[PDB]
Amino acid sequence: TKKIDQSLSKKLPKGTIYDPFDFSMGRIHLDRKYQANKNSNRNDIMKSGANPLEFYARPRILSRYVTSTGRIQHRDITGLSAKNQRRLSKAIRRCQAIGLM
Amino acid sequence: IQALEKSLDELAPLMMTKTFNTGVAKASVIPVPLNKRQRNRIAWNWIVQSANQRVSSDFAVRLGEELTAIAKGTSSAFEKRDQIHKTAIAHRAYIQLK
Amino acid sequence: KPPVYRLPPLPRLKVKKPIIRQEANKCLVLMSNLLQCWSSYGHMSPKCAGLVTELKSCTSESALGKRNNVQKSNINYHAARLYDRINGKPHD
């Protein structure tokens, strides 16, 4: 067979430097273990400094912090500060009461 | 001797399903691999049973005739092998592989 | 910022059932493929010849192959050895 699963091969980006270890399975496993959604902050409005309570009439943004059934995600999952989690949950509950979410 | 080893290698089943009393619930019929010594035992017993249906008073003669027919293609024990392999193909998913 | 959770002092640092990687038996996988090969192309089909030949060699002497079927975890040995050093406990 001339095919390998993507999970068993690492694609080295262009312009990056590499070591021989980057072709091993240890690199594959190490990349899975340390795979965190750290790029969310730059794409996370609520981790930017905006007040989540100003989005109570924008269900599309709020729908990014609820599960498929509408259950607000725990702070352990959203990664927000206590204040933003508190404000975001209020926004979602207000949005639900208005008839938008 | 070469005829005997060829007949034993063609008649013996490669695998056989065995019932394991694992759990209080019903036992599981899982295919199991067989080694060459275990394969020869299964095929030999089939040959002996087939041989003892022949007319000769001498076991050597009945065995000789049975071995000659098997070396010439005709044997009723090939059906037994096909039925043991059919069961194992059915229970292929029951295998554990760990 | 990621919340660090610090444990209280503990009588021990131990994993109840350390996970171990049990590599799959080579003879069992060979048998699982041959059985599948017979399921598609048919029993005794000439397409599964190589599978039959390989299975016979794998199981010739031992039905589960000659493998080092022994693997144990050492996490509990190291955890008990290093706990007092790394727990960050205040001085006496």
Partner: peptide
Amino acid sequence: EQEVLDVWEKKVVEETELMAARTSN
């Protein structure tokens, strides 16, 4: 790099065969 890529070849083949058997289930 060859020394590493040789061990990686073996494991890939092994793990692309356990998947085939496990997936067959």
